[PDB]
Structure formats: structure tokens, C-alpha cells
RNA sequence: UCCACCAAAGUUAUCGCUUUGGUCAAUUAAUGCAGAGCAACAUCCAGCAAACA
DNA sequence: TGTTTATCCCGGGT
DNA sequence: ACCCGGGATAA
């Protein structure tokens, strides 16, 4: 049978035994560091050779072995067996050592001692290579297109033509036609010529641009040609031949000031990243063992650290053929447990036929994928006097994300924000050697504090991020007790109160003491305080009763408890993942509820004019989820389904101008024409019993219903929407 | 009209008994919930619930049988039940009412009034009044402080129905 | 780069519109749900500050 | 895009 | 002398 893998999310608090928690913190917090350097150092090398001689053939260096050697060079260990070294390994080590001293001096890095690191580099480095390939596939072709757009000077020509036609006073239709023909057809011809490795027609590009195309083509071999007459497809099919071409394209883009994009992937996040903890890694690093661990003893060794009796570790899946193979991933807070069934040893609704289309009578639900509203769903049986409509907005799905962003931004210490601002002042995606060195120096200067701040969950914390800070308990309008921003609990029996009349401060001090006592009893708060701190806090609370008026005890308690404000960023990421999963489940449940299990989904494509190729719209992602839940899904053309009035097929137009709701665009454009509201140009609607108003999504779904009816009756798309 | 009794101990020393008579006819749901909690037949009850809050001349409070600090408690019908009615007013001392965080947030916690509370009318449900042991109520109140903290630990040692 | 959800009315299938009533686990918590079975996770990166009409 | 597990040599310590 | 790491390589 084919190999398949499943993953289960868990927390270290639930599955990991306490005795072996601290060593893991030492492992991950180290690995995430080395891996980061394993990226930067690599790029450093690629900048020292290419900057000196572009003829350097670094394409061979893009392999897992080179990344493994780079990772090992950052680890100090006893000398090994030089006789068994391979020639490729010798060359890689010599190349690394050529710049090792310079890179260490620039980054102020010291070789970290880590025995048995060989078994670790094989995993993380395997991902590093994956970063180099996929990234190119994700950015090469598109970026190439952008360069062409800059080579053709598309924007300048469009602006000049727009000004000329405004002087001539042409209408919108005429201007758009003139552009789409005169300015685009030559651009399409040039793009096709570049795609088929052919120089574009002379006269469409100036010398300063033809030289760029010639230089870009010089990178490839004389006899090499793009597979299937498509450079875009060739890049995906044979990425190995475009690394040098991709680097040259990035250099040209930087020369032309295109939007920055990282040619060489780099790990910039300071939060510890997930790493794979293999049985061997567990044996040699977590268990601190000093002998071989075979497969037979693999499960026995694993059981000494984690509780295999938990619900997550046991078998799962149909016939329970998926078994846990002693391999998992973790970043020190969250854990992804992997299970596998194999050993570890190495269609558009318009194209449906009658027999298919006519089976959904009364079951089709038309979905408009709004840019702001993720889905606007209307059942084909909906009536004007009996609405059957649902709305799923992107804001609802991003509620947790925005909440966590606000929490992170509000709780950011002054030092941390200053360091982040200083670091961001240095360009990172640029391939310039000097700028990269400056960025490395800045990162080395700021890491000492950034890693400490973002590693507060597991790493030691000694900096006073909140000096001279006073925190007092407060209760919101919903009877929730907060310290400064931490949630303590909900006092559901707090509303009954007399007329306050704050006659004495001692009563307020007693209330503060009661709130402190309530807070200290919480399970999720006590565990965050060590025994000495808890005893000191209890002593201060006792003293407060003797001297309630004095604020020194409150200040001391606040200073002691200041540690609580350090956000558990990894816990925040885990909560975000859980919230996303729960929101998807909620969407599925709501769809099944308000429309029933018989709902059949019809989804639009885009609001832009008609296109007949890839067009990588984001909706392609969402469709993956719905089909996995059992909802039939079909596509319907949308390019012209929002231009005509459903009532009488007349033209629709935006008529209401409202203040711009987007804060970053208000100053640049205080008022904008409403997009979600439309009116029909025909005035006879008033006789039916002003113009008839419509919502963009409502009109789109009505047009989709009309198209579906036309397909059912005549098996052809309406000419109006064609 | 169900009648219930509590035997109260402070720091392990019994202090007396208090008897409440409920308004089953006018407030059936709240009275039934209070009776069920007192009996403890469903598996939980006020038995051992501390008097975590006592404001002298204002109120006594209790019924937190899961945290003992005012954050716990749950009714037999679930975590919350809608407010029943406000046909009774806090016009006399010794009236028993349900504690809540706001409109339609009644749980299992309860409070006993010691003075007229006209301002509480229309916001809390009253479902019974003290028929005996008001002296014990005053004795318990004397151990409280304006901030609500009690000078000594006070718990409902026993609860039952007559 | 701020914006939780449902319903009545201005209102005609009326908007990042307006006036009301209802919804809540709040959360720096928990692997999630059903009522013992199910559930892809991670590095890079596009998110938007618009890369292809 | 990926989801590890064995074998061999020699320098050092008892 | 003889056994125990620890790196390196390989499928
Ligand atoms: Zn019309």
C-alpha cells in the first residue's frame, strides 16, 4: 500500500515527563540557533564567491551534504577519522573553512559544543535544501514576469496613454480597449518570445533592456531549451538549471528596484522553531545516554520520557493501521506526533452533462468568494420574502490572529521594540554582500536580548523588561478579574455590591489582598512562580494586612509578578492553530445547519476580466478544505456576473461615495466609491414599486442562479454573461 | 413552601442554626434549585461551602462549593439559568437571593440581606426569607469586615431540609 | 493594517451605513469535537503595505 | 518538499 | 592489552 502520514497536536505539559523537560529546552534552544546560522553562513559564502567571481559554479553546492557540512562547521567536537573523508566532503570543508574565521568574526559567534550533532544536521539540513528549491518555484516565474513588466516600461506607457486619452477625452471603455490592445499585445508577444527562449521583436525594448535579456539568457547553456516550450513549466520541472539564472534575475530585479524578494532563504524569526526529535536524538541528547539504541529498544527508550498510554500516542485511523514510530517534532511547547503505516527503514458547473448537472435540482448553493467576505452563500430555493443566506467573513476567521497581534504589540517592552526597529532598518532580502554583512552584525548585536525575550517560556530570564512597573487588579464590565492584562478568572458572583463610597483606603487594600489571594490559587498562575517567589509574595500579602496603607508591599509584589506579562509565544501559535481548526469546523457545521447536508457548492473565480490560464487565486486553497468534508463543489465563471442587474439584465453602477474605512489609505484618499453597493441605471424600477439597489454579493449569487437555470434548461451559458 | 436549615461552624466551633422558608409558589425554579443544592441528592451541594464574603450591615454570601472564593458554583439546571422574576423586593432583613454577575447570569451562589436594599430590586431574584436563627445571622455578620473578608473562617457545616 | 456573530426596521434581496433585541469560555486555558471515532504536521514564503489584464 | 537506521576506525582510559 | 566513546559514511 501507498505510504501515508498523519499528525496529532499536543502540549509538552501533558505528555512529557517533568524529569526530562529541562534537557529538551537545552536541545531545541540550541538547535534553532545553529540552524539559523546554517542558513546565514551559507548565504555568506555564496556572497563572498559570487561577489568575487560570478563564474563560480555554486549550483553543485545546493545539496543536503553542503548544508550538513556547514552545520557541522558551527559545532566544536573532537577530531574524527580523516581517512574516510570523501573528496566532495573535503572540498566542502575547505570552502567552509575559507570563510569560517571571517564569518565568526563578523557574527561574533563561538562554536557551540554539541556531541552527536551528526544525527541532527541530517534532519534540519534536509529542510534547508527544501527551502532553496520550493522558494525558487514559488517566486522565479512570477518575478521574471515582473521584470518583463519593468523591461517593457508598462506602467510609464500606460500612464502616458492615459494622459493622452484624457486630453482627447476618451471614455473608460475606449481607454481600456486602447490599453488592452496596443500596450498589452506587444507585451504578450515579448513574454511569449522570452518564454520560448527567443529574443523579442526589435523595437519593443530599448538597448538598456535588450542588454538585460541578453545577460539573463547568457546564464543558460547554448543547447539547453525549456521543456514543453515553457520557461515557467521548465523551472518547476528542472529547478536545478535555474539557480544561477534565479540569482541573476534577482540581481537584475534589485538593479531595477523591483519589490524585494529573498533569493537565498534565511531564518529570521527569533522564537524557537520546531525540530524533529528522533529516537537517536532522544537517546543521545535528551536521555543523556552514551550507548547505541537499536530499534527493539526504541520503544523502551521512548517510554522513559513520554507517557505512551495517552490518547494521542495510541494507534489511529481506519483499521488502526497507523502506528507511532518513535518520531515526533517539537519546539519546546507544542508537539506534533507523527504516525505512519510503513516501516522507517530506507469541474466547472458549465461543463457538466445533463446526467450530472440535472441531479442537483434543489441542492445547489451559490457561493460568492468576496475579497473581504470569504463566502456569501445563498440557496437556490431562497426567496425575496424568505431569505436563506449565510455570510462567512475573513474578519471572523482572523479574530484570534488580530487578538494575538494586539497582545504582542501592547506588551512589547521598550527595549524589544527599539531592538526590532533597529534590526528592521537593515535590508534583509537584498543579496548585496555589504548589506548582508551589516544585517549579520546587527542581528549579532541584538540577539543577546531578542533570544532571551522570545525564549522566556523555556530559557532563563534575568532582564527586567518592566522596571518600576505598578500593577493593580481591575474588573471589567463582565466580572472578569485582570491583573494588568493577564486573565485571572471570572468572579460570577461579584455584581452584588453596595454604594461604594470610598471612605477608607484600607478597604481598597483589603480588596487588593483578596484579589491577590484569588489569583494565587489559580492552577495556571501558581506553576509560573517558583517556591521562593511564592513565599515572598505570601509574606508581602500577610504584611499588607498589618499595613494596608503602605504601597511598598504592592510595588514589591508587582515587581515579583512582572514575569507573568511575558507572553508564551509558542502557546499563542498553538492556540492560533487550534482556533483555525475550530473555525473551519464551525464553518462546516454552519453550512450543514443553515443549508442542510444536501447542499451543493458553486464557487466563483474572480472579479477581474476573463482569463484562461493558471491565475493562482487564493481561493484554490479553501476549495481543498470543503471537499475534504464531503461537500460537492463546482466552479462558475464570475468575470461578467457582477455587471448586469438580475431584475432586468441592465447595467449596474456604483453610485455612493463614502469615507475610506482603511486607515492607511484615508489620508491618501479620504473618500472612495462604495464597492459592495450597486444600483441599476434603469429608472422603471420605481414604477414596479429611485433605482433598485443591490449588494454586490447578492447580485452575483442571483446572476449565478440565472446562469445555472439557463444551463439546466438550454445547456448553454447566457450570451449576456459570455 | 419548602423549609431548609443550615448548621454553621466558625473555625470548627458550632455557632448555631439558621432556617429559611422559600417562595416555591412565586419562585418555583430558584426555590427548587436551592432545595436540590441543600439536599445534595444530585451529587453536589452547599455542604462545606465557605462564607467567602460577609459585609457587615450589608450582606452575607455563600454557596461556592467548588472554589470557596466566589469564582465557583453551578446550578442543577447547568452553569446558568435565566432570571425568573422580581416579584419580591429586598425590603426587610433576612431575605435570601441569588448572586449573579449580571442579567440572566444566576448560578448556585446565594446571599442573605441584613438591611433594606431598595437599590438591589429589579436586578436580583429573591426566593425566601429567614424564619429562625436571625441571631445566628447577626453573630456571623459580626465576624465580617467592610471589605468582605471575614475575621475567621466560616463554613456551612451541614445543610438539610425539614 | 483597525473591524466577533444572529435577527427586526430606514429598505426595494440596501452598504466596512444607521436605531434596537439576542448570542459568549472570559482566557498569557486546554491537543479539538462528538457524546468508547475521527482530525497533516513542520522549514522557507506569498499574506496586507497589490505580484499578471 | 519531508516524516532513520546501521557499520567501521582509532584515540584514550583502566 | 582490551573495551568505550565519537565522528564519518552509507542505504
Ligand atoms: Zn432592474
Q: Quick gist of this model?
A:
With 722 residues, chain A is an alpha+beta fold. Chain A is built from 26 helices and 19 strands.
Indicate the topology:
The complex is a heterodimer of chains A (722) and B (162).
Chain A: E1 5-11, H1 12-15, H2 21-52, H3 64-73, E2 75-76, H4 87-107, E3 112-113, H5 118-151, H6 154-168, H7 172-195, H8 207-219, H9 231-237, H10 243-255, E4 275-277, H11 279-286, H12 298-303, E5 323-330, E6 334-340, H13 354-357, E7 364-368, E8 375-379, E9 389-392, H14 394-397, H15 399-410, H16 414-424, H17 433-454, E10 474-475, E11 480-482, E12 487-490, H18 505-520, H19 523-526, H20 531-546, H21 552-561, H22 569-595, E13 600-603, H23 619-628, E14 633-635, E15 652-653, E16 657-659, H24 663-666, E17 671-673, E18 677-680, H25 685-688, E19 693-695, H26 696-714
Parallel strand pairs in A: 2-3, 7-13, 13-14
Antiparallel strand pairs in A: 1-6, 4-5, 5-6, 7-8, 8-9, 10-11, 11-12, 15-18, 16-17, 18-19
Chain B: E1 3-10, E2 13-22, H1 28-39, E3 53-55, E4 59-62, E5 95-100, E6 106-113, E7 126-132, H2 134-142, E8 154-161
Antiparallel strand pairs in B: 1-2, 1-8, 2-7, 3-4, 4-6, 5-6, 5-7
Residues 645, 647-648, 650, 680, 682, 685, 692 of chain A line the site of zinc ion.
Chain A binds three DNA and RNA strands through β1, α1, α5, α7 and β5.
PDB class: rna binding protein/isomerase/dna
Keywords: Fanzor, Eukaryotic, RNA-guided, nuclease, Gene editing, RNA BINDING PROTEIN-ISOMERASE-DNA complex
Assembly: pentameric
Amino acid at each position: 500500500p501507498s505510504k501515508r502520514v498523519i499528525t496529532i497536536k499536543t502540549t509538552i505539559k501533558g505528555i512529557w515527563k517533568y524529569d526530562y523537560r529541562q534537557p529538551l529546552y537545552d536541545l531545541v534552544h540550541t538547535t534553532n540557533l545553529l540552524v539559523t546560522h546554517t542558513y546565514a553562513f551559507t548565504k555568506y559564502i555564496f556572497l563572498k564567491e559570487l561577489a568575487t567571481d560570478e563564474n563560480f559554479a555554486f549550483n553543485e553546492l545546493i545539496t543536503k551534504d553542503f548544508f550538513v557540512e556547514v552545520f557541522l562547521s558551527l559545532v566544536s567536537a573532537k577530531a574524527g577519522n580523516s581517512e574516510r573523508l570523501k573528496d566532495t566532503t573535503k572540498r566542502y570543508r575547505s570552502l567552509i573553512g575559507k570563510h569560517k574565521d571571517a564569518y565568526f568574526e563578523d557574527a561574533k559567534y563561538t562554536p557551540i559544543s554539541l556531541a552527536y550533532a551528526q544525527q541532527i544536521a541530517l534532519y534540519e539540513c534536509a529542510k534547508v535544501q527544501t527551502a532553496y528549491f520550493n522558494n525558487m518555484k514559488a517566486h522565479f516565474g512570477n518575478r521574471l514576469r515582473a521584470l518583463i513588466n519593468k523591461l517593457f516600461k508598462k506602467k510609464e506607457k500606460v500612464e502616458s496613454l492615459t494622459k493622452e486619452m484624457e486630453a482627447n477625452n476618451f471614455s473608460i471603455k475606449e481607454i481600456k480597449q486602447a490599453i488592452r490592445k496596443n500596450v498589452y499585445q506587444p507585451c504578450n508577444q515579448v513574454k511569449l518570445a522570452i518564454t520560448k527562449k527567443n529574443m523579442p521583436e526589435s523595437g519593443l525594448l530599448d538597448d538598456k533592456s535588450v542588454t538585460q535579456l541578453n545577460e539573463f539568457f547568457s546564464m543558460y547553456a547554448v543547447d539547453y531549451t525549456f521543456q514543453k516550450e515553457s520557461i515557467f513549466y521548465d523551472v518547476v520541472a528542472n529547478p536545478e538549471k535555474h539557480f544561477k539564472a534565479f540569482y541573476k534575475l534577482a540581481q537584475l530585479s534589485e538593479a531595477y528596484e523591483v519589490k524585494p524578494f529573498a533569493c537565498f532563504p534565511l531564518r529570521r524569526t527569533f522564537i524557537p522553531c520546531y525540530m524533529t526529535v528522533d529516537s537517536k536524538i532522544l537517546n543521545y541528547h535528551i536521555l543523556k545516554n552514551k550507548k547505541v539504541l537499536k530499534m527493539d529498544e526504541k520503544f523502551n527508550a521512548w517510554g522513559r520520557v513520554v507517557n505512551l498510554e495517552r490518547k494521542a500516542f495510541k494507534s489511529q485511523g481506519c483499521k488502526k493501521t497507523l502506528h507511532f514510530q518513535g518520531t515526533l517534532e517539537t519546539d519546546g511547547v507544542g508537539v506534533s506526533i507523527l504516525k505512519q503505516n510503513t516501516d522507517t527503514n530506507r469541474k466547472y458547473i458549465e461543463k457538466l452533462e445533463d446526467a450530472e448537472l440535472k441531479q442537483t435540482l434543489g441542492k445547489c448553493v451559490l457561493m460568492d468568494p468576496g475579497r473581504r467576505d470569504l463566502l456569501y452563500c445563498m440557496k437556490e430555493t431562497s426567496r425575496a420574502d424568505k431569505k436563506e443566506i449565510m455570510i462567512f467573513t475573513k474578519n471572523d476567521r482572523s479574530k484570534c490572529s488580530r487578538h494575538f497581534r494586539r497582545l504582542r504589540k501592547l506588551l512589547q517592552p521598550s527595549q524589544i521594540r527599539e531592538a526590532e526597529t533597529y534590526l528592521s532598518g537593515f535590508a534583509t532580502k537584498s543579496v548585496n554582500m555589504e548589506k548582508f554583512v551589516e544585517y549579520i552584525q546587527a542581528r549579532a548585536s541584538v540577539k543577546d536580548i531578542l533570544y532571551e525575550y522570545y525564549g522566556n517560556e523555556t530559557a532563563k530570564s534575568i532582564t527586567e523588561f518592566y522596571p518600576e512597573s505598578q500593577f493593580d487588579f481591575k474588573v471589567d464590565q463582565k466580572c472578569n478579574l485582570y491583573y494588568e492584562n493577564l486573565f485571572v478568572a471570572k468572579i460570577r458572583g461579584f455584581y452584588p455590591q453596595p454604594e461604594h463610597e470610598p471612605n477608607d483606603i484600607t478597604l481598597k487594600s483589603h480588596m487588593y489582598h483578596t484579589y491577590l489571594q484569588i489569583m494565587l490559587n489559580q492552577k495556571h498562575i501558581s506553576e509560573r512562580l517558583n517556591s521562593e517567589k511564592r513565599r515572598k509574595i505570601e509574606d508581602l500579602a500577610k504584611a499588607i494586612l498589618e499595613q494596608p496603607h503602605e504601597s511598598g508591599h504592592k510595588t514589591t509584589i508587582s515587581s515579583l509578578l512582572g514575569k507573568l506579562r511575558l507572553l508564551p509565544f509558542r502557546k499563542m501559535k498553538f492556540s492560533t492553530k487550534l482556533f483555525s481548526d475550530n473555525n473551519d469546523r464551525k464553518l462546516v457545521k454552519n453550512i450543514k445547519k443553515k443549508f442542510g447536508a444536501d447542499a451543493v457548492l458553486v464557487l466563483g473565480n474572480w472579479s477581474a476580466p476573463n482569463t484562461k490560464y493558471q491565475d493562482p487565486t487564493r481561493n484554490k486553497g479553501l476549495r481543498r478544505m470543503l471537499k475534504k468534508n464531503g461537500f460537492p463543489l463546482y466552479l462558475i465563471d464570475e468575470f461578467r456576473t457582477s455587471s448586469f442587474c438580475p431584475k432586468c439584465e441592465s447595467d449596474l453602477e456604483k453610485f455612493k461615495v463614502i469615507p475610506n474605512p482603511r486607515p492607511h489609505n484615508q489620508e491618501k484618499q479620504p473618500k472612495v466609491l462604495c464597492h459592495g453597493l450597486l444600483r441599476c441605471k434603469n429608472m422603471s424600477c420605481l414604477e414596479q414599486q429611485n433605482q433598485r439597489l443591490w449588494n454586490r454579493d447578492q447580485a452575483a449569487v442571483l446572476n449565478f442562479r440565472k446562469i445555472l437555470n439557463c444551463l439546466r434548461e438550454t445547456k448553454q451559458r447566457p450570451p449576456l454573461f459570455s | 413552601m419548602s423549609q431548609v436549615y443550615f448548621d454553621v461552624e466558625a473555625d470548627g466551633q458550632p455557632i448555631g442554626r439558621v432556617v429559611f422558608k422559600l417562595y416555591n409558589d412565586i419562585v418555583p425554579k430558584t426555590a427548587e434549585n436551592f432545595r436540590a443544592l441543600c439536599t445534595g441528592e444530585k451529587g453536589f451541594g452547599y455542604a462545606g461551602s465557605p462564607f467567602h464574603r460577609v459585609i457587615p450591615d450589608f450582606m452575607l454570601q455563600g454557596g461556592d462549593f467548588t472554589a470557596g472564593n466566589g469564582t465557583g458554583g453551578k446550578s442543577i439546571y447547568g452553569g446558568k439559568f435565566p432570571d425568573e422574576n422580581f416579584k419580591k423586593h429586598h425590603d426587610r432583613p433576612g431575605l435570601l437571593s441569588m448572586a449573579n454577575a449580571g442579567p440572566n447570569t444566576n448560578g448556585s451562589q446565594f446571599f442573605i440581606t441584613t438591611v433594606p436594599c431598595p437599590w438591589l430590586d429589579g436586578k436580583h431574584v429573591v426566593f425566601g426569607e429567614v424564619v429562625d436563627g436571625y441571631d445566628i445571622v447577626k453573630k456571623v455578620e459580626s465576624l465580617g469586615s467592610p471589605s468582605g473578608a471575614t475575621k475567621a473562617r466560616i463554613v456551612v457545616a451541614k445543610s438539610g431540609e425539614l
